[PDB]
Amino acid sequence: ALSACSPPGETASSEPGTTPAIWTGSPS
């Protein structure tokens, strides 16, 4: 019965990020 800790790698951001580029797949 003790306290809580937030996950060290679960922060939020403010950058909106770029739209994903169209995908192309290598033959193999």
Place this chain on the structure above:
Amino acid sequence: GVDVEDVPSAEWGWSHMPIGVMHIGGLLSAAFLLVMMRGNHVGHVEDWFLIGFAAVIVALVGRNWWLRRRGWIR
């Protein structure tokens, strides 16, 4: 830790719990209710419910301790 006048069948079985156990139990229960306010929830109605119940428990423990400290309650 009790008398026949308080617990008639005291000789027959375990019939007394030291008041320290109850006092620290109340304090720990209040601390648990308070510490449950840290976590994941947007709303704050539950925080007020926890605060109210912790306040009631602390008030009960404080009154009982004060009355045993002054002599009225034994």
Place this chain on the structure above:
Amino acid sequence: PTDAELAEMSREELVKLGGKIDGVETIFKEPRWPVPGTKAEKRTERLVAYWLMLGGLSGLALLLVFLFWPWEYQPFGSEGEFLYSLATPLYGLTFGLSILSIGIGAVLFQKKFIPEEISVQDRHDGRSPEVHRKTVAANLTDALEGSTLKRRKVIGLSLGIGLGAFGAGTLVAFIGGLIKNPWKPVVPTAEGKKAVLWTSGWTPRFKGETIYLARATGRESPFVKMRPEDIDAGGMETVFPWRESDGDGTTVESEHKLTEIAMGVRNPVMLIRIKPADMHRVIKRKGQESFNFGELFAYTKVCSHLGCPSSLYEQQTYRILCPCHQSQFDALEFAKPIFGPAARALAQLPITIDEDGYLVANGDFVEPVGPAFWERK
């Protein structure tokens, strides 16, 4: 008592003597019907008889119903489904009624005809008499002292060493077949061989592998590619990692691969199209600002608490809910757990479209997916 006077004891006297030998005194025992020839005795006898006879007739009913009732399953909404539905309740009724009636008859016979008694037995518990305790202690001590093992320390030390070593070796050779390293690299990946818990079916395997988000049609070809316009806003989809080289379920190896991707515990993905009127409310996670393709977000369908499928999408609150323990994650805030016992956000899968437009995964999960463990983070 001698044989001659044992020959001349009545049965009651012999019962008294036998009980007295064992330490038991029956201080009360009286027949249930002292007054002969009453109607009440006849009534009670017939009551016990009726209960036993009901048990017999119910056992007969069990035999008959089991042998002759129509028991085979009948399809939905057809004739004979009522008789099929009654099949098993009739077995239960007949069997339970028969044995319960027999038990009731036995109880009534005990209460009404077997004479009421009050016997008293002496416990003779606690410590044994000193003769027994001393003799048994002397026998044990004499065994240990005549063995002479005490005054031979080399033999005792060798015996302890040998027995402990054999026990340790046997225990190790027993448990050792079950011990498996969870971190042995066994899963191929576009970055070598990796442990199972670090990988799922979304992990690319040859550095540019096209992994399609395929819906489960639940049918030959249970998975099919899908397009972004196949999800209306506020709609939810369960997609799986399906590649071209997995097949369409016709060939047996194709079915094996499709089964192995449908049974992957970390495979299912929840794909949700946010309504544009709410896309301003989206808060994005650091390092995942570019994982959505417009209005379509993709998260893991595995709860971060204990691995149940958090598969309840409430669109008007954008809340992902896990029914196993009532965790709530906010789909507008990178699936951050807003309620319940979950403390970690759901992983977000990067998605985009290919040249044809079919939705594909734009990489791998940027973290382990399921419930946490020691070696995570």
Place this chain on the structure above:
Amino acid sequence: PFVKMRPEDIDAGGMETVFPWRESDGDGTTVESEHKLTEIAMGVRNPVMLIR
């Protein structure tokens, strides 16, 4: 796992274990095909000694 035969395949003094194969059983690529071929090969009264 199952292919047809001709009287010239087996030779005088040879022996062959043959199984009843219909032309709707197939060759085992599809799942129903492999189930049917397994049923053929795991039927206790199916195999036949063919001797020339």
